[PDB]
Amino acid sequence: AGERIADLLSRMTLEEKVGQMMQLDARGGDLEDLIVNKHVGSILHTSPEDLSRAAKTVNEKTRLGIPLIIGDDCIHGYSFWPGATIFPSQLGMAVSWDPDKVKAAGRATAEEVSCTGVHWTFSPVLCIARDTRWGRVDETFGEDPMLIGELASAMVKGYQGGAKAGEALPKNAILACAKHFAGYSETQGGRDASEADLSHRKLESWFLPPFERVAKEGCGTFMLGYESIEGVPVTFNKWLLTDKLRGAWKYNGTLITDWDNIGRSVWEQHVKPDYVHAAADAVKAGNDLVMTTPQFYEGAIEAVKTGLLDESLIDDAVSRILALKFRLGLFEDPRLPDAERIKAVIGSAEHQQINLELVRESIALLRNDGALPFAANKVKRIAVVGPLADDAQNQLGDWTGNSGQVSWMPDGQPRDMITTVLDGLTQLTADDCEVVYSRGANVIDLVPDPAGEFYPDGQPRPKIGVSAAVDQALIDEAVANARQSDLIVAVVGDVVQLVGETCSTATLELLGGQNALLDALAAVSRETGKPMVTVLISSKPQVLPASIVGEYGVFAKRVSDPETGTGSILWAPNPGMRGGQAIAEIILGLTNPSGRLPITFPRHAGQLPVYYNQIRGQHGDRYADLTQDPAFAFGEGLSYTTFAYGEPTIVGGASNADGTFAETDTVHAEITLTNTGERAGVEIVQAYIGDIVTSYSWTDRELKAFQRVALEPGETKTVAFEIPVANCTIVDPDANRIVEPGEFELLIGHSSRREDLKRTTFTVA
C-alpha cells in the first residue's frame, strides 16, 4: 500500500481466484459500479464525462483498491474526444515520410490524452498494407516494413515521451500499443479476419520487422491479432508469443487480445469447443489482458476448478499486469482528469500548428499536367465540386467519432473548425474571387437491410450503404458551375461506411456518380481548356476512371505523365482537421507539395498484389488483358520544382581489404541532388538494397533508407546514407533472417521505379 520495492507485489496473497480476474478488460459503459464490482483490471471506450468516476469507484467501492489501467483508441489524435486535435490518418502521415513530425503528432496526442484519465492508446498500427482490398489500409503506414518501422518507432517515442522498457511513464505521456501482432493485414481475399496463410518465413519476411523494432525499443503494450494464422489464431500462437515476442525479442511489455479474440475462437472460428478450453489455452499461451470476453470469467474459474488450468499461471498473469500498474505509479497516483490542463492543451493553437505542418506534407502530388499551381489573382471564379469537397466527417475518416466505434459524439468532431477543401479553397485563402460549391454526385444510397427492419431484440437494423445511383441533375449543375468558372477542383473519395472493420472493398472504385461526374468534368476541361485538378480524399488507394488515369489495356501510359488523361491529380488520404487548408495552399502555390506514396495504387483489383517488393520468378511480366505497371508506384510524388541526381557512390565503411564488406560493417554512400527549378522544394531521397543472388527466392529490391531533403533554387546537397550490412538480409525456410555473402546493388533516387533510381554495387564476404 506504500513505497516498498515493486517485487513485493507478491502480496497478491489476498486476491481470491475470483478477483484474479484482473486479466479482463471490459467494454464501458456505463455501469462502472457493476464493471468495477466485477474484479476487472481494465476498461476501454469510457466516455469523457465518466473517466472521472472510474478511479473514484475504485477507491471508494472496492475491497482492495487496485487502480484501473484505462485505455482507448486514440488512433490519429484523440479520436473520440470532442474538440481534440485530429491529425491525418496513419496512411496520410506516411505520405509525409517525416518521422519527426509523426513523433510530434504522437507527443501532442499524448499531451491531450494524458490529462483526461486515459493512460493508454491502442496505437500505432504496424499492419502492412499488402492488399488494397483490406478495409483498414487507412490505419497502416503503407506497404513497406522499413517505412512502417521508422514511423511506428517515432510515434511510440512520441506517445511515451521517450520512456523505454521498465521506466517511469511521464505525466504527459501514455502507453503505446503495437497492433495488430501479427499478420492481420494479408488475409484471404483482403477480408477482415479471414485466414492468414502466412508461414513463419513469410511473417518474418514482411510482417515482423516493425514489431521486433518497437518491441526492442520498449513499446509499452502489444495487441494480439484477430485472425487465424495457418490454422492457429494469434491468441494461442506459441511461435509468435513465446518464440518471437517473449523469446527472441525478450519483450517485457504487457499483452492484450483484440476485441473478443477468445470468444471468436469459439463461435466465429470454430477452433475451440467451449469457453473453458478457450480460456485455458489462452492463459497457457501466455496472454495477459483479455479484451471484451465476459465468458472468460466463468471460463477460467471452471478451468481451474476442473483441473484443466493451473491457477499459478493465472497468478503469473496477474503478476505481470500488477507489475505494469506499479510501474506506472497508479497505486499512488491514478492520474485523474485535469480540468485546467484539459482546457489548456486539448485543441491548443500549438497543436493546431503541429497538425498543419504535418498535413502540409501528408498530401501527394501525383500528376501535374502543367496548370499547377493555380494563381489566385489571375482567376475570378473556381468550381469546387464533388461529394468530398465539403464532407468534414468523412474527411476525418475512420476511427474518429462519429466513425461508429463509440456513441457519445453522434455529430462527429465539431464542425466549427474542421477545414474542408471548400473552406480552404479558396473561401479562406484568397480574396473575393468566387468559390462555388456543387455536390456533383452522391457516394452511397442508404437502403433498408434486406433481412428485416429490426434485429430480434426490437432494435432497428441500420441502413446499408450501396453504390449511389447516378443523379444527372447534380452532374448538370456541377457542369454548369464548371463552365462558369476559371478552374475545376473535383474532390472525390470514399466514406466511413466503405472503410474499416468488416468493410473491405473488392472493386477499389469510387462509388456513386463520382465516375460519371469526373467524366463530365474532364469533358468540359478538354473542350474549353479550363484547368482541372482531381483531389482524391480516400482512406486508401482507389481506381479512378479512364478519363482521369487513362485506359488500362495490355499496354497503358504512365499515369503520372503530364499528358495522360485529363487534369492534375492530388492524393490526400484522410488529412485531418487542417487538410482542406493544406490542399488549398498546394493548389494555389502557397505550399509546395512534398508527399510521396507509402503504398502502390493498382489499376484494377485483378492486378493484386501490387506492392513494390515483388518476388522474382514470374514467367512473363503482363496479364493478357492488363499491364502489370501500377497506376502509381511506391515512392511516387511530385513537387513544384525539378531535381537532378548525380551518380551514387560508395565512399567507405568496408573493413576487409578485400573483401570488401563484412557482416558487421556499414555501407556509406553519397549522391548529389540539385534543385534545377525556379522555387524551393523537398525531395524524399529513397535508398533501396537489392540482393542480386539469393539462396532462397526473394524480392529484387527493398527500401532501406530515406531522407527528406530541402533545396533552394540552384542549391545542390550531398545526400549521405549509412546502411548496415546487417540490414541487407533475406529469410531462410526456417524463418531465420541472415546476411548472405555475394553481390548487392544500391539504388538511390526518386521512387521505387527502377527508371527513377541510380545504381551502384558492393560485395559482402
Name which of ligand BGC, a copy of itself, none residue 581 binds, using a CB cut-off of 5 to 8 Å depending on partner kind.
none
Name which of a copy of itself, ligand BGC, none residue 179 binds, using a CB cut-off of 5 to 8 Å depending on partner kind.
ligand BGC
Name which of a copy of itself, ligand BGC, none residue 306 binds, using a CB cut-off of 5 to 8 Å depending on partner kind.
none
Name which of ligand BGC, a copy of itself, none residue 258 binds, using a CB cut-off of 5 to 8 Å depending on partner kind.
ligand BGC
Residue 222 found at the interface with ligand BGC (CB under 6 A)? no
Residue 203 has a CB neighbour count (10 Å cut-off) of 23
Min separation Cβ 122 and ligand BGC, Å: 3
Residues between 562 and 601 with contacts to ligand BGC, criterion CB under 6 A: none
Residue 314 has a CB neighbour count (10 Å cut-off) of 22
Residues between 490 and 509 with contacts to ligand BGC, criterion CB under 6 A: 501
CB 44 within 8 A of CB 32: no
Name which of a copy of itself, ligand BGC, none residue 122 binds, using a CB cut-off of 5 to 8 Å depending on partner kind.
ligand BGC
Q: What is the bridge-based pairing of β-strands 649-652 and 666-675? A: antiparallel
Q: Which is nearer to a copy of itself, 307 or 617 (CB)?
A: 617
Encoded one letter per residue, x for contact with a copy of itself by CB under 8 A and - for no contact, window 224-243 reads --xxx-xxxx----------
Q: What is the rounded CA–CA span in Å between residue 237 and residue 478?
A: 54
C-alpha cell at 726: 546487417
Residues between 389 and 448 with contacts to a copy of itself, criterion CB under 8 A: 447
Give, for 175, the enclosing helix (H) or strand (E). Answer: none
Q: What is the rounded CA–CA span in Å between residue 688 and residue 702?
A: 5
Min separation Cβ 180 and ligand BGC, Å: 6
Name which of ligand BGC, a copy of itself, none residue 73 binds, using a CB cut-off of 5 to 8 Å depending on partner kind.
ligand BGC
Name which of ligand BGC, a copy of itself, none residue 455 binds, using a CB cut-off of 5 to 8 Å depending on partner kind.
none
Name which of ligand BGC, a copy of itself, none residue 535 binds, using a CB cut-off of 5 to 8 Å depending on partner kind.
none
Min separation Cβ 513 and a copy of itself, Å: 14
Residue 223 found at the interface with a copy of itself (CB under 8 A)? no
Q: What is the rounded CA–CA span in Å between residue 463 and residue 666?
A: 58
Residues between 385 and 424 with contacts to ligand BGC, criterion CB under 6 A: 405
Residues between 255 and 274 with contacts to a copy of itself, criterion CB under 8 A: 264, 268-273
Residues between 473 and 512 with contacts to a copy of itself, criterion CB under 8 A: 497-499, 501-509, 511
CB 236 within 8 A of CB 282: yes
Residue 308 found at the interface with a copy of itself (CB under 8 A)? no
Q: Which is nearer to ligand BGC, 224 or 489 (CB)?
A: 224
Residues between 136 and 195 with contacts to a copy of itself, criterion CB under 8 A: 188-195
Residue 211 found at the interface with ligand BGC (CB under 6 A)? no
Bond from prior residue into 660 cis (ω within 30 degrees of 0)? yes
Encoded one letter per residue, x for contact with ligand BGC by CB under 6 A and - for no contact, window 116-155 reads ------x---------------------------------
| Candidate list 179, 213, 367, 701; residue touching ligand BGC; CB under 6 A | 179
Name which of ligand BGC, a copy of itself, none residue 507 binds, using a CB cut-off of 5 to 8 Å depending on partner kind.
a copy of itself
Residue 268 found at the interface with ligand BGC (CB under 6 A)? no
Q: What is the rounded CA–CA span in Å between residue 742 and residue 765?
A: 7
Who contacts 472 (Cβ-Cβ below 8 Å, separation ≥6)?
none
Residue 195 found at the interface with ligand BGC (CB under 6 A)? no
Q: Which is nearer to a copy of itself, 25 or 691 (CB)?
A: 691
CB 489 within 8 A of CB 385: yes
Helix pair 311-327, 296-305: axis angle to 10 deg: 130
Contact stretch for a copy of itself (CB under 8 A) within 3-11, 71-79, 143-151, 727-735: 727-735
- In the block, cell 512520441 appears at 158
C-alpha cell at 368: 501535374
For the purposes of burial, counting CB atoms within 10 Å of the CB of 271, is it exposed (0-12), middle (13-18) or buried (19 or more)? Answer: middle
Q: What is the rounded CA–CA span in Å between residue 395 and residue 575?
A: 7
Residues between 448 and 467 with contacts to a copy of itself, criterion CB under 8 A: 450, 464-467
Q: Which is nearer to ligand BGC, 262 or 669 (CB)?
A: 262
Give, for 601, the enclosing helix (H) or strand (E). Answer: none
Residues between 595 and 654 with contacts to a copy of itself, criterion CB under 8 A: 604-609, 614-620, 622-626
> Burial letters for 336-368: b for 16+ Cβ neighbours within 10 Å, e otherwise?
ebeeebbeebbbeeebbebbbbbbbbbbbbbbb
Q: What is the rounded CA–CA span in Å between residue 40 and residue 390?
A: 43
Name which of ligand BGC, a copy of itself, none residue 268 binds, using a CB cut-off of 5 to 8 Å depending on partner kind.
a copy of itself
Who contacts 572 (Cβ-Cβ below 8 Å, separation ≥6)?
92, 362, 363, 364, 535, 536, 537, 579, 582, 583
DSSP string, 619-676: SSSEETTEESS-SB-TT--B-SS-EEE---EEEE---SSSS-B-TT-EEEEEEEEEE-
Nearest to 486 by CA among 542, 408, 433: 433
Q: Which is nearer to ligand BGC, 73 or 683 (CB)?
A: 73
Residue 747 found at the interface with a copy of itself (CB under 8 A)? no
Bond from prior residue into 106 cis (ω within 30 degrees of 0)? no
CB 193 within 8 A of CB 135: no
Min separation Cβ 324 and ligand BGC, Å: 17
Residue 239 found at the interface with ligand BGC (CB under 6 A)? no
Encoded one letter per residue, x for contact with ligand BGC by CB under 6 A and - for no contact, window 27-66 reads -----------------x----------------------
Binding site for ligand BGC (CB under 6 A): 44, 73, 122, 179, 258-259, 405, 501
